[PDB]
Design a protein around this nucleic acid. Structure first.
Length: 297
DNA sequence: GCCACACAAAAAC
DNA sequence: AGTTTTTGTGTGGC
């Protein structure tokens, strides 16, 4: 009934079928590692503005709630939350140096004056129909759920960091207590206002981030597929979905390559230029039908 | 079919 | 050692 896999940090993922077994909403059994991500592609190269060193980048994503590995399929439920977290890394490039440096997008080689300055790096997530690439709406809630606002996942400015262990994501999922919040603060945030400003040049990457509080980890919790999504094909076969994580550089718009428009802080129209994208294997999503639940048995 | 509210069980404190 | 919070899911109204 429950199939158990050991996670990297020594916790367990316990996969079960909600058609057959009902477990309490707050049981630690609802936390589990979801499907592994795979590279879709790399997009625009990034170089350091002084040395010309190519910045090697890697997205490091994980799903920590909402998906079970059942009979060689990954299965989620329309009605329930999932959690998707991600960081990125810059191999052989330490954070302290990275933040003092500045970076350009190489849109065209052999054009030293043909480079856009990166203001900051950021992640976004998307859901798609894995068979035809059509995008599917995601919705997020606060902990208050219906007694609070609903919103679409947003673009998250981030600095490179190791991805926290599964247990750490669990532990930080519903922290209100001030003392405990402080314990986790250095894991999830870089507070630019707390650095020694004298160590930084005006053009440094750190000081082109939009806000003083900068995330180290993109944490998308309490996410759902929109309640209007059709989860079956007309043939009654299951639709296959995929979750995508995209790392981008935000630049000033002042374009033959992939990008999305972004509403900037100063009001103008930023550009989120794609750098790398990863995706999950195909996902099945079970709808609200009573037959998807053990109560029907 | 999608919404709104309802119940309840374990986490959080 | 209690009370509040959070979230899977049962249910009714249109």
């Amino acid at each position: 009934v429950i199939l158990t896999q050991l996670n990297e940090d020594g916790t367990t993922s316990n996969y079960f079928d909600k058609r057959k077994l009902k477990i309490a909403p707050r049981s630690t059994l609802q936390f589990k590692v979801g499907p592994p991500f795979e590279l879709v592609r790399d997009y625009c190269p990034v170089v350091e503005s002084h040395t010309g060193r190519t910045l090697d980048l890697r997205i490091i994503p994980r799903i920590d709630r909402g998906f079970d590995h059942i009979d060689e399929e990954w299965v989620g439920y329309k009605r329930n939350y999932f959690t998707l977290v991600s960081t990125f890394e810059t191999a052989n490039c330490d954070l302290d140096t990275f933040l003092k440096s500045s970076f350009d997008l190489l849109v065209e080689d052999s054009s030293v004056e043909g480079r856009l300055r990166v203001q900051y790096f950021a992640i976004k997530i998307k859901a798609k129909n894995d068979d035809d690439d059509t995008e599917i709406n995601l919705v997020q809630h606060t902990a208050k759920r219906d007694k609070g606002p609903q919103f679409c996942p947003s673009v998250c400015p981030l600095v490179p960091s190791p991805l926290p262990k599964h247990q750490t994501i669990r532990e930080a999922s519903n922290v209100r207590n001030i003392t405990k919040m402080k314990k986790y603060d250095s894991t999830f945030y870089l507070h630019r206002d707390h650095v020694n400003y004298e160590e930084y040049g005006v053009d440094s990457l750190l000081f082109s981030y939009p806000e003083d509080s900068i995330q180290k980890v993109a944490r998308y919790e309490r996410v759902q597929f929109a309640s209007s999504i059709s989860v079956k094909k007309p043939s009654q076969q299951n639709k296959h979905f995929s979750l995508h994580v995209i790392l981008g550089a935000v630049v000033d718009p002042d374009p033959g390559i992939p990008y999305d428009e972004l509403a900037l802080k100063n009001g103008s129209k930023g550009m989120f230029v794609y750098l790398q994208e990863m995706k999950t294997p195909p996902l099945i999503i079970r709808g609200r039908s009573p037959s998807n639940y053990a109560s029907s048995q």
